[PDB]
Design an enzyme around this catalytic site. Structure first.
Site, PDB file in Angstrom:
ATOM      1  CG  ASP A  81      -2.237   0.444   1.139  1.00 57.60           C
ATOM      2  OD1 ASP A  81      -2.801   0.135   0.072  1.00 57.60           O
ATOM      3  OD2 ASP A  81      -2.781   1.099   2.059  1.00 57.60           O
ATOM      4  CE1 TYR A  99       5.756   3.870   4.549  1.00 55.24           C
ATOM      5  CE2 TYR A  99       6.798   5.147   2.773  1.00 55.24           C
ATOM      6  CZ  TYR A  99       6.858   4.181   3.775  1.00 55.24           C
ATOM      7  OH  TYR A  99       8.042   3.519   4.008  1.00 55.24           O
ATOM      8  CG  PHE A 139       9.583   0.293   1.135  1.00 58.27           C
ATOM      9  CD1 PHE A 139       9.066  -0.048   2.369  1.00 58.27           C
ATOM     10  CD2 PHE A 139       9.608  -0.632   0.117  1.00 58.27           C
ATOM     11  CE1 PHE A 139       8.582  -1.326   2.593  1.00 58.27           C
ATOM     12  CE2 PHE A 139       9.081  -1.907   0.305  1.00 58.27           C
ATOM     13  CZ  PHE A 139       8.615  -2.251   1.560  1.00 58.27           C
ATOM     14  CG  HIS A 164       6.933  -5.982   5.172  1.00 60.54           C
ATOM     15  ND1 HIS A 164       7.105  -4.792   5.854  1.00 60.54           N
ATOM     16  CD2 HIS A 164       6.430  -5.657   3.964  1.00 60.54           C
ATOM     17  CE1 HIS A 164       6.720  -3.781   5.094  1.00 60.54           C
ATOM     18  NE2 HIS A 164       6.301  -4.282   3.938  1.00 60.54           N
TER      19      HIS A 164
END
Length: 225
Positions: A60, A62, A73, A183
């Site tokens: 997703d 942020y 990221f 993750h």
């Protein structure tokens, strides 16, 4: 071949265009959507199909102000480094010689070296993680991964988390190089992300095949007079 060459037909499909209609509607319905419309496809802007060397999947975008800007990221200049990215930086500092903690979370300079920072879902409602997960984005990014798998050779894929791992489950592990780890999120990073040695490992694969390694220390756009 460019991204538009191989995605032009895909982007004319109703699932895809209905996805954009929904986003366009929600932006005008009293809901903030991230990232801004001009940034949704920045991963494709910054690393063209033929330039892809390393693919790092996010899930997703942020969902806070100033964070998302179309790169998995990464956050904009001046924004706090999110915990997932801080854990990536920690693995980098423990493994890449000379690496030190950046004072920012902006990863455009990775993208410009061939790191495709691809979220599998490309928009989100502010403060509401996964809120656009059931629109057409996963279909679209499935097609993107499929095209890289077919059209490119020798790409490293870094698949972090069960979702990313499933997502790249059918990549050709002969013609490409797939690396798996839990993750970098605080909820999973000590369960195997730390010690994964993916940044070095990716670079060694690249070097092996005559390509230059990624400079993983990210840099901010400079000032002019």
């Amino acid at each position: 071949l460019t991204w538009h060459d191989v995605l032009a037909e895909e982007k004319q499909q109703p699932y895809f265009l209905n996805t954009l209609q929904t986003v366009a509607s929600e932006r005008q319905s009293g809901v903030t959507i991230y990232p801004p419309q001009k940034d949704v496809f920045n991963a494709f802007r910054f690393t063209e199909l033929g330039d892809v060397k390393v693919v790092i999947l996010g899930q997703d975008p942020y969902h806070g102000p100033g964070q998302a800007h179309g790169l998995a990221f990464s956050v904009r200049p001046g924004i706090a480094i999110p915990p997932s990215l801080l854990n990536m930086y920690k693995e980098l500092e423990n493994t890449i010689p000379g690496f030190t903690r950046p004072n920012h979370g902006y990863l455009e300079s990775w993208a410009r070296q061939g790191v495709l920072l691809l979220n599998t879902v490309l928009t989100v409602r502010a403060g509401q993680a996964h809120s656009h997960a059931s629109l057409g984005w996963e279909t679209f990014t499935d097609k993107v991964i499929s095209l890289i798998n077919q059209h490119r050779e020798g790409v490293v894929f870094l698949l972090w988390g069960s979702h990313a791992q499933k997502k790249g489950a059918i990549i050709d592990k002969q013609r490409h190089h797939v690396l798996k780890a839990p993750h970098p999120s605080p909820l999973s990073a000590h369960r195997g992300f730390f010690g994964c040695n993916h940044f070095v490992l990716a670079n060694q694969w690249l070097e092996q095949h005559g390509e230059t390694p990624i400079d993983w220390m990210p840099v901010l756009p400079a000032e002019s007079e």
